Amino acid sequence: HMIPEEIYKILRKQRYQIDGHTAVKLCGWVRKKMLEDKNCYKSKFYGIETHRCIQCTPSVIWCQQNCIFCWRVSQIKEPKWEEPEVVYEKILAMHKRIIMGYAGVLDRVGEKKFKEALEPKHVAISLSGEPTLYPYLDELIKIFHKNGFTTFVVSNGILTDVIEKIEPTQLYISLDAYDLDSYRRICGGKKEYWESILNTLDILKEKKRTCIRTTLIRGYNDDILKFVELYERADVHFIELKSYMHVRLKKEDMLQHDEILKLAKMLDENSSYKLIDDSEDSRVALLQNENRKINPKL
Ligand code: SF4
């Protein structure tokens, strides 16, 4: 099998659907939307419909990094990667199976929202693992677009050549460090990976729509001004500043939303990125490149 039996069982206990090297998991906000009509911050920022979003990955347990906030639950060989048409159908089928779990509480959801959740519109390729290690990621994105889905892809940015090729609706680069020392401390990566990430920053301006997401951990990377030169080098459309969310680390390592706002305002005061929105629920601030202004709403 592609995944060790122990890992497979652990992921199933974490409520992952797994088929080969591909996985889908219901985002916690989908549940809150279905049962409480609560929207996620991506709905607020970008106009996405929370209950119509698939959270998935084509590379569930393969990633080059070893971050301090990753794998709270390194020698697994890479699988024989499946064709992108197959990965696409498996993602849609696993998502359908998860949404069908609401059939037994239709009166708590309502038939309208149920029928809408069965017709997803948005795909967040961001669940676990590094999507660019899947060698047909570009093709997979194209298939989603031709079938009417918007795509968000979150990448660590190491594989510059893949970032150059792909064109999701919005490309996220995780940037949780600002020099080699902090990169090793936080991401557990090699110095060669950090240099490659910097090369990726240089070409992000060539992409159609970009966002850097920085996950802030108290005392590890929360000196926000140390990121400014990298953010300016990257010249992306948006930045998301987000607190670490606990459960290796402790709950006290989370930043208060007021601290996220403080750091976002400092970033605003010291950079060409301007604070334009925030969500206390998810402890995230949205900043916009004042020299590359585009509408945040998709
Ligand atoms: S856009 Fe991100 S936060 Fe919103 S439902 Fe999808 S995965 Fe969850």
How long is the chain? 298
Give the number of the atom of ligand 1 that is nearest the alpha carbon of residue 30.
5
Q: Is 187 annotated as a binding residue?
A: no
Resolution (A): 1.6
- Residue 238's SS3 state is strand
Residue 119: partners with Cβ closer than 8 Å, 6 or more residues away: 52
Taking alpha carbons only, the member of 220, 222, 247, 237 closest to residue 273 is: 237
Residue 168: partners with Cβ closer than 8 Å, 6 or more residues away: 125, 141, 151, 152, 153
Q: Is 63 annotated as a binding residue?
A: yes
Backbone angles phi, psi at 133, to 5 degrees: -75, -20
- Ligand 1 centroid to Cα of residue 284, in Å, is 13
The parent domain of residue 87 ranges over: 1-298
Name the residue with tokens 């990566």.
189
For residue 161, CA distances in Å to 109, 132, 177 come to 43, 9, 21
Amino acid 223 reads D
Pairing of strands 122-125, 53-57: parallel
> How was this one solved?
X-ray
Residue 236: partners with Cβ closer than 8 Å, 6 or more residues away: 173, 204, 205, 210, 211, 212, 289, 292
- Ligand 1 centroid to Cα of residue 98, in Å, is 15
Q: Atom 3 in ligand 1: which residue has the minimum CA distance?
A: 40
Structure tokens given for 23? 């996985």
Give the number of the atom of ligand 1 that is nearest the alpha carbon of residue 54.
6
| Number of independent structural domains in the chain | 1
Q: Is 56 annotated as a binding residue?
A: no
**CATH of residue 234:** 3.20.20.70
